[PDB]
């Protein structure tokens, strides 16, 4: 139960004809997949662990002005030229200053001078690309066996490494068989269109074009001595003091302005490897060769006693921690539910097969009770431990929460959000295709619109759709406007 | 929740307090209007070399 | 700032967001509105940095 009470888990139930279900695995939150006869198992993506980063260019945030040399030619003559202009280590500017007899020139008028300053730039930003050839992914899979001290245990699991080379893997769960992960890291995230920029000890994921469009001097990354910079005047200001002379002043450390310019970028790790977090990918879970823990186990014949107060998780799933007081150790727990003196059995059981492994280690079970008051029975006779739970809520409220969760997923993920619980359906595929077309056309229009400008554009667009007589586009404009209100109210996660 | 310190499941408060040191700083100086002083040159066209 | 000085409109100087203190040449002062130079980020929902 590595993922119980994680605040973002979302259940996937039902397989396809070939007993496979695909799923998108986001870093924040996991996927607990249950089937009719397969063990319910928690799957959470952990890290992407990129390696062999190549550095494209190095923006540099603070410079140093040295060797300020100048040359002024008399007016009514060619513009001043210095040998340091041709040098690639120097930054120069041409200006016009007033020259008379007191300045040495024979005839009055504006004269041209240049001030070439040798640009040496102290602290720099390295922008590193990751190639899909060496992108990695670590997936931890946990069939939540009824097991002591397993609820919400991040340290317990069976890791499966899925790289674009040999993406399809097979994770050998210790007792329940071998889960298969036939996945595609190619469509997980746009790492071709991203730059990892490492400033001091931190770093971030930023869009490639945004990184290339930054107002900062840049040099091609080749690990060479005394690099030649480009666009140096972005950290050098030349000030003409009343058109008599000019001086060269370096701006300073662009670290704070760079941290403010990074708002909206997702932070990353640098110490101990790249280990990009905040990613996502799509796995197709092949549960063909999974098996339950001894479906043929003899049913337990002695009563169970509680050992921890039953607590309801955020999603309404009960957690019962029981200790078995019998002598026949390997046995399958008898579990049943009631509702209002009627064995409706509307309460489901997430933990597929509650078997007591040792009879000395207390066993914990996660169950999903009905929305009404329900009595849960964990025994066979009158010694049966009876838990009654009242689950506050409504089925309509549950549907609304699920719809909101799905919309939030369709906001974080685009066209690929239709494959979260897909079983390869026909309606689902058509919906994915139409959403692909519409989302491409939409994000093409709103690429770059900010958080508040999206809301403003949406309210303007819905007002326009309310006042347009042609209903064929009035409905379309209102729909688009509401979608954009939602996206503006969801963006900046 | 469970596996994290206590039985009840939900959202728990958390606070991370951190000391602050300024390092570099900048100071705005008001100009004392009494001590403000203007110096103006009066050169006369006398034809000195 | 360091060896450079500027004339700035006083209201604009008071408006610019940066932690500030009385400027009474006291070592280790207390900076009002010091939250502008610290950012607290949640690693999803697990922790605080």
């Amino acid at each position: 139960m590595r993922c119980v009470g994680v605040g973002n888990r979302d259940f996937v139930e039902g397989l396809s004809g070939a007993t496979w279900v695909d799923v998108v695995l986001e870093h924040g939150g996991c996927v607990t997949t249950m089937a009719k006869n397969k063990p319910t198992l928690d799957i959470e993506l952990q890290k992407t662990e990129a390696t062999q980063l190549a550095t494209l260019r190095k923006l540099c945030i603070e410079g140093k002005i040295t060797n300020v040399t100048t040359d002024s030619r008399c007016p009514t003559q060619g513009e001043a030229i210095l040998p340091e202009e041709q040098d690639q280590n120097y930054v120069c500017k041409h200006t016009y200053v007033d020259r008379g007899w007191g300045n040495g020139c024979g005839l009055f008028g504006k004269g041209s001078l240049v001030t070439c300053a040798k640009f040496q730039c102290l602290e720099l930003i390295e922008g590193k690309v990751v190639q899909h050839e060496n992108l990695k992914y670590t997936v931890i899979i946990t069939v939540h066996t009824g097991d002591q001290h397993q609820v919400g245990n991040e340290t317990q699991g069976v890791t499966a490494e899925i790289t674009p080379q040999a993406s399809t893997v097979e994770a050998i769960l210790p007792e329940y068989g071998t889960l298969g992960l036939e996945c595609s890291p190619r469509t997980g995230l746009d790492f071709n269109e991203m730059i990892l920029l490492t400033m001091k000890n931190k770093a971030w994921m930023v869009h490639r074009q945004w990184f290339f469009d930054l107002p900062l001097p840049w040099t091609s990354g080749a690990t060479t001595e005394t690099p030649t910079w480009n666009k140096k005047e972005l950290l050098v200001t030349f000030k003409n003091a009343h058109a008599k002379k000019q001086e060269v002043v370096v701006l300073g450390s662009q670290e704070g302005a760079m941290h403010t310019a990074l708002t909206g970028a997702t932070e990353i790790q640098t110490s101990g490897g790249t280990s990009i977090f905040a990613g996502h990918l799509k796995c197709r879970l092949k549960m063909d060769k999974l098996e339950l823990k001894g479906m043929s186990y003899a049913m337990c014949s002695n009563a169970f006693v509680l050992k921890k107060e039953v607590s309801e998780t955020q999603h309404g799933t009960i957690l019962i921690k029981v200790e078995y007081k019998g002598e026949d150790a390997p046995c399958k727990i008898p579990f049943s539910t009631e509702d209002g003196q009627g064995k409706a059995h509307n309460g489901r059981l997430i933990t597929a097969n509650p078997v007591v492994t040792k009879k000395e280690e207390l066993v914990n079970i996660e169950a999903e009770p009905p929305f009404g008051e329900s009595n849960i029975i964990i025994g066979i006779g009158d010694k049966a431990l009876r838990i009654n739970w009242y689950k506050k809520g409504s089925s309509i409220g549950k549907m609304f929460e699920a719809t909101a969760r799905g919309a939030r997923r369709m906001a974080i993920l685009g066209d690929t959000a239709w494959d979260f619980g897909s079983v390869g359906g026909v309606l689902n595929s058509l919906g994915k295709m139409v959403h692909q077309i519409f989302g491409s056309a939409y994000t093409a229009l709103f690429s770059g619109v900010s958080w508040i400008m999206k809301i403003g554009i949406g309210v303007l667009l819905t007002w326009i759709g309310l006042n347009s007589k042609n209903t064929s586009m009035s409905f379309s404009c209102i729909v688009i406007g509401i979608i954009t209100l939602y996206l503006g109210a969801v963006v900046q996660a | 929740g469970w596996g994290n310190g206590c039985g009840l499941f939900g959202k728990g408060s958390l606070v991370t307090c951190a000391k602050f040191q300024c390092l570099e700083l900048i100071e705005g100086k008001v100009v004392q209007h009494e001590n403000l002083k203007y110096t103006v040159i009066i050169t006369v066209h006398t034809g000195d070399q | 700032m360091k060896n450079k000085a500027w004339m700035v409109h006083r209201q604009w100087f008071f408006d610019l967001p940066l932690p500030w203190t009385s400027g009474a040449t006291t070592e280790t002062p207390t900076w009002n509105k010091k939250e502008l130079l610290v950012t607290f980020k949640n690693a999803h929902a697990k922790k605080q940095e």
Partner: antibody
Amino acid sequence: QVQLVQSGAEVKKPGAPVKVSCEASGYTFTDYFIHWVRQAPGQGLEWMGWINPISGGTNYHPRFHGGVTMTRDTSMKVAYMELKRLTSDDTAVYFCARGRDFRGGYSQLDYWGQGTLVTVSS
Amino acid sequence: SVLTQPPSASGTPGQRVTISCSGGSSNIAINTVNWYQQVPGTAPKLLMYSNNQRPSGVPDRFSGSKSGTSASLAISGLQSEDEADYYCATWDDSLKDVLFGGGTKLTVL
């Protein structure tokens, strides 16, 4: 205990690169500079550049920019330094010193190295 | 601007030693001064780890201060061990580099 120990005394002829090294141990290397000071025989002390091993940025003295290069190599906690084309004039002893990151600690140096003396003669 | 200091000396009885560095308006006037002791043949030692602040030992025989564009190291009486080469170092901002003094051979006489 924190200390800096050099590579050891070296001698080379004019027009030959030399790579003076400086070992660092006992503290967090990435949190302090290496100020690589120079001192000619019986002459005034002369600072010539520091590097930030947390990032690798180098602040050479204007005189020594281009003539010298400094590398952090934070894996082994060893702040290397190289001289591109060693001349007869540049005979001295090259200390490596530890300085603080902030402005008040730019010019304060504690735990200097012994200094690798480099003699240049034909 | 380059900060300067002259070589000085004093007798073994510690009357007073006045060893002064006069820098520009960008190096000394806005940055803390740092004093260094160098016994010949040895690596320099950080005599002052800040303006008018001592890291360890030798109290009241080494005590400095800066007023405006100049800095100095005062005394309440010298000893025989106080014979070394002294350096004042400040981080210039216009030149954006660490400036070291020209040197001074203080000899116990």
